[PDB]
Amino acid sequence: GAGPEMVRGQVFDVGPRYTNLSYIGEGAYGMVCSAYDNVNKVRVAIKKISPFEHQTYCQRTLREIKILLRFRHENIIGINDIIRAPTIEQMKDVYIVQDLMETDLYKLLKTQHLSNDHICYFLYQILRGLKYIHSANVLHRDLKPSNLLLNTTCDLKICDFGLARVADPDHDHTGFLTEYVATRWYRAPEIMLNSKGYTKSIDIWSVGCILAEMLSNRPIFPGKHYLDQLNHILGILGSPSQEDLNCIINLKARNYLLSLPHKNKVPWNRLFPNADSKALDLLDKMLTFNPHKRIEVEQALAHPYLEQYYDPSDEPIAEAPFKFDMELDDLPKEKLKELIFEETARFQPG
């Protein structure tokens, strides 16, 4: 009648509701498949996560689950269901069921020229999702083309909230060259100078990078290592102004910048000769060196480039700010498992 399905070695212990599995992919998170959902009669994405042997996998798992169960928005991936063992003792895996999406913006950019109309619509949707995220006082912190899912009609949904944080602007400052987790090519210049990435402006930078990559099918700042990232940024933006330098009070960071030879700004219309001029005006405001001067999500949405889409009444916000009950670091592997168990109880037969 039935048994545990396998795919590429792994038990996919998702039944009886989810059958007829096909491999999609794999990564540090675990493994993903499409499955036929027998209750909704659609194929769905299912990712098997096995995080309980290291506490960082447990952190990313719990952030993802707690945030995405709280959020409800058309441009943010939901969680449809969660499968796991009936007891903590028996729970070695978590299967998170999500809407199946045809592709992602990373895959699309490696194969497809984007028309200006596509770029405009994708950007609208990224920002409309990010408006909602930021309205819940949450930062995604790892926005990049592979975290933007697309269906066959180019509807876009933001995924992967494992690095997300509640914003904390009063604790954003750090020293020069502080190590960072999120993806290098989409890191704002301030991460490498004086920022822990605890403000909304870090996501706007990444969106800026994504827009540039939509315009040319190539990453704008493909740094090969921590500090090379900053030098790619300054290679295009040019040397910071005295005003922007004076906002960096950390001497090591300031003096690093002062030690560099003077570079002029490469104008956007030379990097992007076929781009719409309104798109480059918005790009410029998103890829501003000084995070205080960088455009905010709601201002970006109101930019002339997006005028055909802009409608604040149809760009919803969250009902209330997000807050974690407990600080998720300094919490052991063993407690994060318990919290995962609790957070997934609603999907159990009961």
Ligand SMILES: C[C@@H](NC(=O)CN1Cc2ccc(-c3nc(NC4CCOCC4)ncc3Cl)cc2C1=O)c1ccccc1
């Ligand atoms: C926090 C957690 N990380 C993740 O869960 C990150 N992932 C992995 C992943 C894989 C697939 C999809 C996906 N893909 C499609 N279609 C594809 C069809 C083929 O072309 C590409 C798109 N459709 C719906 C979805 Cl949801 C979403 C995610 C996601 O968000 C973690 C990390 C470390 C440790 C522990 C937990």
